[PDB]
Design a protein around this nucleic acid. Sequence first.
DNA 1: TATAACTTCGTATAG
DNA 2: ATATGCTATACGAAGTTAT
DNA 3: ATAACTTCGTATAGC
DNA 4: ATATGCTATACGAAGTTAT
Lengths: 322, 322
Amino acid sequence: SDEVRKNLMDMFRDRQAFSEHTWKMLLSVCRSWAAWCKLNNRKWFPAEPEDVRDYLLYLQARGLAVKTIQQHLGQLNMLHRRSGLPRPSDSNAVSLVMRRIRKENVDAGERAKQALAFERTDFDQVRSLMENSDRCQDIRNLAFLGIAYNTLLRIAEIARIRVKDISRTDGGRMLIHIGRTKTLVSTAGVEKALSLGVTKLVERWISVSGVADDPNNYLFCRVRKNGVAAPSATSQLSTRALEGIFEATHRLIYGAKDDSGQRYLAWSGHSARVGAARDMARAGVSIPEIMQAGGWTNVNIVMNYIRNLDSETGAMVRLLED
Amino acid sequence: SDEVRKNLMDMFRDRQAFSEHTWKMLLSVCRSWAAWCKLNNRKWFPAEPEDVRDYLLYLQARGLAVKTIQQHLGQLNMLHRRSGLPRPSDSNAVSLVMRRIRKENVDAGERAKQALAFERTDFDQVRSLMENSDRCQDIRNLAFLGIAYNTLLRIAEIARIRVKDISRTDGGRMLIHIGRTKTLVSTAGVEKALSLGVTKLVERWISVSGVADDPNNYLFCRVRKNGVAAPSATSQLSTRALEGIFEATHRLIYGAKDDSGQRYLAWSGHSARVGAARDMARAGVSIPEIMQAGGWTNVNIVMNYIRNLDSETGAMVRLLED
DNA sequence: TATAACTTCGTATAG
DNA sequence: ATATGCTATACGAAGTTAT
DNA sequence: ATAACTTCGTATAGC
DNA sequence: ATATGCTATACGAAGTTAT
């Protein structure tokens, strides 16, 4: 009892060992665990094998994906392994349930999804539809869609871009010094170049936003219902908003969502990555050159984004078709 | 305890099982650690996790790299584990703070650097200049640089080359047999072949040096101020010296180093290794080949040596501007 | 003799 | 090569603020 | 009121 | 990415020795 008390103390002391996103995910499973526990009358700490087993089967019946269920058992294991208690994973029962749960769900046809592709053809359409709009928020959203599809950057990354990071490269095109790595052995930063057109799109946004009045202002900002931008160097556009620009843009062209509870029915924050990656493959860009685009050090993700491309059908098809 | 003393005694007895450098650092750390303990009135062995934690934060606060801080923790770990005692990393306090130290440092931008590349052009330009020198020193250096780039061998392996290790192909190309490297203790050994041009550079050195006088002579040796090579079958040219060749060569082409005090402002011992790896990548050379070339067994290391090839390629810009 | 060209060595940091 | 597991995106919805 | 976000909570993709 | 375990390089400072 003392030993766990101390180990809990360790964690909050070096709570910085993890990102707030992680902690938030940890607290979410405890609340879930604790609530299922009190409800079913089981001590939630230290968790017992059968109880955990019973909970995991409950998450499965709850319709949660295998990775989600693994994430629940995961955190639960952290807590225990960290404190002086054994991890439920080391128990025969839990080990067995996850196993059957895994294949039962795979058997049912569970598949990992990914963002709906936002391709050049999509960008062209949007660009056309909104090219001549004078609406501030529209100008912002086109520039965003340009940078996002052009740079393949992630949403949290586009969010952090300040004005002082935009340099002018050859031809007048824009260059954005950005940071897309978070490991010791990696590249501290990269420079992203924008085509002539996309640079023009962003040029208009900044001109109609005033984000440039102060270099420390983030490229993208809030635009209120009056169509009036709200520059700032301290607060940035949330990633939810950036996700909003994608969904909203999808509605513009396809109207209300395809209902259903399904995910990726409209565009999301990773849609441009999936799209740029596939156009690059379609254009025959050197596989590594594609990795540079998105910052991949392996081809695992890019192979998923282009899995259905005819250029990736394989040897057997190549042989059969001579 | 008596076993502890015994295990340490065993360790020391079979010192040769470990590299001289491992021992070197084991003692340097113990020097750091024991000084901190003394300055804080603590027992330096066995170490108490809470104490080791304060030590690490002390190191991070002294402005040391994550890798050097992980080094100090690693030596304490080996020491304790070899002693039959629990490793500091075994405790929550120590494991959490390390993750925290690393996280924060990386978050603020720390990146493990790598040697300034010495590529094909740097070699051509250097050869083109030193090619005409008659000085024994110059002839040795050029040959050294040539083997470094051609074989990618680390400076400690180049310095262990004995004249008897050199062979030749019927094509008239030199083959240098290498037995032990940083990552390999085998009797199998590999044959590192040199190009016709590089064999030539190596020949001129052998001829003007006289190391061939005895096959058990190290291929490389010192060259005193009067131009007389001092062969030896018991003493190799120090790796510290081989590093000086790279630095002096860089100073040749670009003058005296910056006064920033930073590392890698001039070519160093690993410059040709990373530079050649990057040249092959650029060349479109398959990973198994680059692997063979550098004596790498894993693919991650290669990508690690390539790590800084990550730059704008203009792949998307070209795609959008058409 | 002065000194080029090392060598040895310790702390720091990459592979 | 596979996990494992930390961290980011997903997205419906509640909370918030200036038109 | 309500556009346009932001802040949440928690599922699930990406390293 | 990541945590072992450990082996090698980076580089300024100071000591060495045939010229």
